[PDB]
Amino acid sequence: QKIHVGPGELDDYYGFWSGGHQGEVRVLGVPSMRELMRIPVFNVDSATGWGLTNESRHIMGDSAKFLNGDCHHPHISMTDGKYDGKYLFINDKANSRVARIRLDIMKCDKMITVPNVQAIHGLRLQKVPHTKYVFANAEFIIPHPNDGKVFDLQDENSYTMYNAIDAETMEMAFQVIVDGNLDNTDADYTGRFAAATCYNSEKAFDLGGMMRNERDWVVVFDIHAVEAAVKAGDFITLGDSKTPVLDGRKKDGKDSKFTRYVPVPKNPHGCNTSSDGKYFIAAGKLSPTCSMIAIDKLPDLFAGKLADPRDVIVGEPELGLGPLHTTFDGRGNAYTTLFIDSQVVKWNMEEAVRAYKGEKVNYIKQKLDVHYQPGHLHASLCETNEADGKWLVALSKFSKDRFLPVGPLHPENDQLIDISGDEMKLVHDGPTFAEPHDCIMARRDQIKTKKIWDRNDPFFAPTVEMAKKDGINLDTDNKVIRDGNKVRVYMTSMAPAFGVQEFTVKQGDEVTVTITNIDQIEDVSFGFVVVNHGVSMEISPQQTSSITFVADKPGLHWYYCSWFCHALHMEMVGRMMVEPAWSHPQFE
Amino acid sequence: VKESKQKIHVGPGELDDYYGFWSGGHQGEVRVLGVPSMRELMRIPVFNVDSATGWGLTNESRHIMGDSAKFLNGDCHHPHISMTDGKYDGKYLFINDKANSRVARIRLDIMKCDKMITVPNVQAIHGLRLQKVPHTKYVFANAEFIIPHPNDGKVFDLQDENSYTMYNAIDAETMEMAFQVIVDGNLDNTDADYTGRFAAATCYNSEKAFDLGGMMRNERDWVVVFDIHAVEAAVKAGDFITLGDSKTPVLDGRKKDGKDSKFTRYVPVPKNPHGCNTSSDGKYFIAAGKLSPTCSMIAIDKLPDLFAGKLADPRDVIVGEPELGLGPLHTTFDGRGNAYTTLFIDSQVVKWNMEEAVRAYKGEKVNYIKQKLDVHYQPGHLHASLCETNEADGKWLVALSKFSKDRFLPVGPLHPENDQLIDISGDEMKLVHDGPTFAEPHDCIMARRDQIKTKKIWDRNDPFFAPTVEMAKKDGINLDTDNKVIRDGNKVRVYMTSMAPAFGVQEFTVKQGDEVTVTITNIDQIEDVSFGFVVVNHGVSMEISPQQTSSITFVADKPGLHWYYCSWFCHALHMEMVGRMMVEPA
Numbered sequence A: 001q002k003i004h005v006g007p008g009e010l011d012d013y014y015g016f017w018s019g020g021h022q023g024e025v026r027v028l029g030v031p032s033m034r035e036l037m038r039i040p041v042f043n044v045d046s047a048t049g050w051g052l053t054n055e056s057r058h059i060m061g062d063s064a065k066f067l068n069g070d071c072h073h074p075h076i077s078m079t080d081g082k083y084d085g086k087y088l089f090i091n092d093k094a095n096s097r098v099a100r101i102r103l104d105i106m107k108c109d110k111m112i113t114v115p116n117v118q119a120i121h122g123l124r125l126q127k128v129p130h131t132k133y134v135f136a137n138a139e140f141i142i143p144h145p146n147d148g149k150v151f152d153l154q155d156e157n158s159y160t161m162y163n164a165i166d167a168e169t170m171e172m173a174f175q176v177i178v179d180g181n182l183d184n185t186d187a188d189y190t191g192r193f194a195a196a197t198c199y200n201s202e203k204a205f206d207l208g209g210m211m212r213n214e215r216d217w218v219v220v221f222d223i224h225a226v227e228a229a230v231k232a233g234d235f236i237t238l239g240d241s242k243t244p245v246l247d248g249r250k251k252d253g254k255d256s257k258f259t260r261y262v263p264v265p266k267n268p269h270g271c272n273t274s275s276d277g278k279y280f281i282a283a284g285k286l287s288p289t290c291s292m293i294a295i296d297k298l299p300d301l302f303a304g305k306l307a308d309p310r311d312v313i314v315g316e317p318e319l320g321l322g323p324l325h326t327t328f329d330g331r332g333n334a335y336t337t338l339f340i341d342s343q344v345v346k347w348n349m350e351e352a353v354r355a356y357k358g359e360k361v362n363y364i365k366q367k368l369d370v371h372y373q374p375g376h377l378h379a380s381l382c383e384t385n386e387a388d389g390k391w392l393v394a395l396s397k398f399s400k401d402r403f404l405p406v407g408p409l410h411p412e413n414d415q416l417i418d419i420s421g422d423e424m425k426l427v428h429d430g431p432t433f434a435e436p437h438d439c440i441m442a443r444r445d446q447i448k449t450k451k452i453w454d455r456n457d458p459f460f461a462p463t464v465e466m467a468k469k470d471g472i473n474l475d476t477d478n479k480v481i482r483d484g485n486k487v488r489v490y491m492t493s494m495a496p497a498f499g500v501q502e503f504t505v506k507q508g509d510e511v512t513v514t515i516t517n518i519d520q521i522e523d524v525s526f527g528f529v530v531v532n533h534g535v536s537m538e539i540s541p542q543q544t545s546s547i548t549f550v551a552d553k554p555g556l557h558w559y560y561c562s563w564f565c566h567a568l569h570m571e572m573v574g575r576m577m578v579e580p581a582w583s584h585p586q587f588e
Numbered sequence B: 001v002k003e004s005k006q007k008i009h010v011g012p013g014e015l016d017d018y019y020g021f022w023s024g025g026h027q028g029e030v031r032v033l034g035v036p037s038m039r040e041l042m043r044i045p046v047f048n049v050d051s052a053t054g055w056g057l058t059n060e061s062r063h064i065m066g067d068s069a070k071f072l073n074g075d076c077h078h079p080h081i082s083m084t085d086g087k088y089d090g091k092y093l094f095i096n097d098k099a100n101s102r103v104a105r106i107r108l109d110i111m112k113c114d115k116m117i118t119v120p121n122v123q124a125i126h127g128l129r130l131q132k133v134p135h136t137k138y139v140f141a142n143a144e145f146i147i148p149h150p151n152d153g154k155v156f157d158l159q160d161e162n163s164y165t166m167y168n169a170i171d172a173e174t175m176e177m178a179f180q181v182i183v184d185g186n187l188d189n190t191d192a193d194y195t196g197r198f199a200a201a202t203c204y205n206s207e208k209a210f211d212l213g214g215m216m217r218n219e220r221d222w223v224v225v226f227d228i229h230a231v232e233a234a235v236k237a238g239d240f241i242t243l244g245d246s247k248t249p250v251l252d253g254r255k256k257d258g259k260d261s262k263f264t265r266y267v268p269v270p271k272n273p274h275g276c277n278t279s280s281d282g283k284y285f286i287a288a289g290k291l292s293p294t295c296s297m298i299a300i301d302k303l304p305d306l307f308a309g310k311l312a313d314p315r316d317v318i319v320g321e322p323e324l325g326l327g328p329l330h331t332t333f334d335g336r337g338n339a340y341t342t343l344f345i346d347s348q349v350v351k352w353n354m355e356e357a358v359r360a361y362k363g364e365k366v367n368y369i370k371q372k373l374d375v376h377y378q379p380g381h382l383h384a385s386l387c388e389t390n391e392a393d394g395k396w397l398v399a400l401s402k403f404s405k406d407r408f409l410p411v412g413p414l415h416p417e418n419d420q421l422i423d424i425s426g427d428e429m430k431l432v433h434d435g436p437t438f439a440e441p442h443d444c445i446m447a448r449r450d451q452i453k454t455k456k457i458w459d460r461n462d463p464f465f466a467p468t469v470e471m472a473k474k475d476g477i478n479l480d481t482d483n484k485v486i487r488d489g490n491k492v493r494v495y496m497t498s499m500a501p502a503f504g505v506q507e508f509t510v511k512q513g514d515e516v517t518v519t520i521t522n523i524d525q526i527e528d529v530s531f532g533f534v535v536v537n538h539g540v541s542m543e544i545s546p547q548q549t550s551s552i553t554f555v556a557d558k559p560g561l562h563w564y565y566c567s568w569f570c571h572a573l574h575m576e577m578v579g580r581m582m583v584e585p586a
Ligand code: CUZ
Pocket: A072, A073, A121, A122, A184, A269, A270, A324, A325, A375, A376, A437, A438
């Protein structure tokens, strides 16, 4: 297996890395581990103007006021248990959002703030028959309503909820109230079941309280039952949200129709569906184990055919200190991070199942030292029934001495490991910023990108509609539209000239500049920066982009093209002339 | 005969040999890479807002940014490392912001931006380089765009006698302005000599035009040379004016009725020249011809004669003008007597011998071109290791190319830059690595591993958060021990220590509408155990690394229970490192 990608060679896989607390998504080539692109999502990107432009702020909605995000869990949409390459979805734990990235243009095209919850952490996708739902955990228990009268986590109206988003519309589909809380989540290969770990069955707020119980659980959702209750109208709504809310809590020991709680030790974390569809595998964290839930025993669990919820556990291998996450090679082996022992443990799922029945067998095949304190790990295609067992990335939280010193803040160490053979081979240490938690790989042929925008792309269709109200044809026009104290500049552009190279406004006018890159040559992107006004955006081939700012300073103000586009790039500039307020009518 | 055959693979457990400091381009940060692996080790926020560390949100960062904290963007090109006696001293890195007209300083011991200045009375700080000798007393910065003075909206004419741009000198150590020099034309790139007396800058808009054709009309623009000693003498004598409300001394470096300033000389150079690069032997300012397929070599040791009026023609300081290829943009040096120049149009790096170029200019038939290496594609800047110092070591070359085309997997309509690593240690340049990068770093700078010394943990007396220590002192707080909530009208100031896996203050209560400042001190001393602080659904996020104090201010505008949590995985019980803010309604 080739490890190094030389000049002129291409990588074999795309990697989509979470940006962690930095808030973006990063596209890597694998196995080179080089970063090919950054996709802004919850961060504000100076380069493309994401968070500044009108198109991006429209997608972000009211949450455009936040300049931060905290993303952990990138996942690719699937059809019949295989990636279909349409969308990447990712969480925001900081401001409680889910974002969608369109993989043909490699941009965030939709974003939603999940209502009546705090902190979207775990996130994964329905696999079968396709990604109808995005499943997202809200991690923190809060009051309902959260109006400041009640703060007690033990109140009967304090809880968190499991969240289903319609992947295509990016509107809420339903929410399920649960006991305890929600950490990570995964889905089966039938569409009936999803599952989530809980570490706060105690509903505590202090460290000791959250570790009190010997077992928490993974909660299992019967999605068929949830859908059935929604269609029957058997649900409530919270606050001003129209999202159907179903009650998945136990009441006086009787189970809900929507949920079953499988006791699992202890403050469990990772929740990973095996690629053969057989198991939800929960990482025991404070317990030195993983718990294997047999997915084919869940219908019987939901039909009272089992005496004890633990009867759906068919394995609980002891693996090492601090199990956090598990991935799969498609050959019947699982790979689990041990945070405390600082290792990846490779183990055979069917032998662990046999040892659980007493048959003394050594299911542990290898322990590889990683550097250091691994969190998530990811094997290529692990989330599909095409898991190919080639590459493994372990994403470790302390890099210590593995890279040159760069001051008190250290990079993370995402290590590429060869798993095509019986023996795990550490091949590359990849330093990364801001703590990617997880990542996802896709074959090169699973991703199909556009090299030039379509003119009807929904990403800027609202801007096209605005332009139409002014009588503008964006493909041809270079016009300055005036409307009271608003000025709307529309221009085409082609290297190395802006189609409108000067315009004049009054001091205090609100200026919108809309630019259409009317060339069709791949890689010839333009920028637009207004000096000393905090204005910057990208305009790639056939894109329309727009940005709005106040001309608060009299005098002449240069704008220029920021993206090197031509040998005359330094010369692709223009001038905004601002007439002073004392020369125009005076308002208070 | 010597071959180029350095190893490029840095395997697991091995370390890079050089630091690389990449400009973040239009994205606004500075990036620390390891060389030769070309892996990004760290990102240093400067003009961008960084969600992860809180740069742009925290009180410490917004203090450093001053009023320009209102801007969420920057546009970087030119990172440079401070020097002593013409060698990197590892103290500071400086970088420009073309978008909002700033210069930033990064402290290389903590890898943070610690000072920032908006250059007064100019637009668009682009070219930037450092004094070399006797040390980096000044940062030299080019303002690219001609503007009216004053720029009050009465006059828009760039041909008006009070429309001009200025060369800028910033005191490297205080990060206050030292002086400005009005010039004719405009300013593109700049460099300094190896004595401290001279600096030079290319100009492309000697025409003072605003249109593309008008800017290319002159067969020759110039490199303007500055007699910094003469500027300093005039400032010491009080012979200067000031502009607007800035106290910065302003000297007039324009020609008047054909008579030279004592501060400047204008050396005619073809054509819209771009790069302006000092050879590592101190002999030449080398201007890259761009629209002219040449570079022009100015003999620095002729400049004293030029300013003393001993030369008949400013062209007499030109001692070479080699023809190299189409679209020369930038030049760097191996320390062995070769220069390496990017050809943007031909898409090559050309290696050429400077002394042979000089003899060729005298009419001697000698081939000074040694090799042309195809690069991929359209190179802008290039940088050989230690090239800006008299220790230029001729080992590594990076060419930063603007069109990557098919060199990487497709990723949509926007493509990465291609920063290509080239082995120059031997007689033949060898291309060894294609490094994709985001948002167009324009230029980069390398330093030996042993030239950079970083802190493993913060100093409690660090200036970076000294204003916060002072706030704490006014409240009677000992940041190393205290976990206290100070109430001051509708202001609430929470102070806490933190140790893994627990915030020192795990709950506090405020009134809806209160303005909340949370100050956190990471009181452990284990390297690499950083904490975060995020307030859910309030847009609040920041880093607190070991022994650091960080603070952030936000208004509690939502009644109810609002969780906060530690964003930096710091401990097996990281998920449980949380707290509650309780907000009472009216
Ligand atoms: Cu958010 S948790 Cu193991 Cu995923 Cu990192």
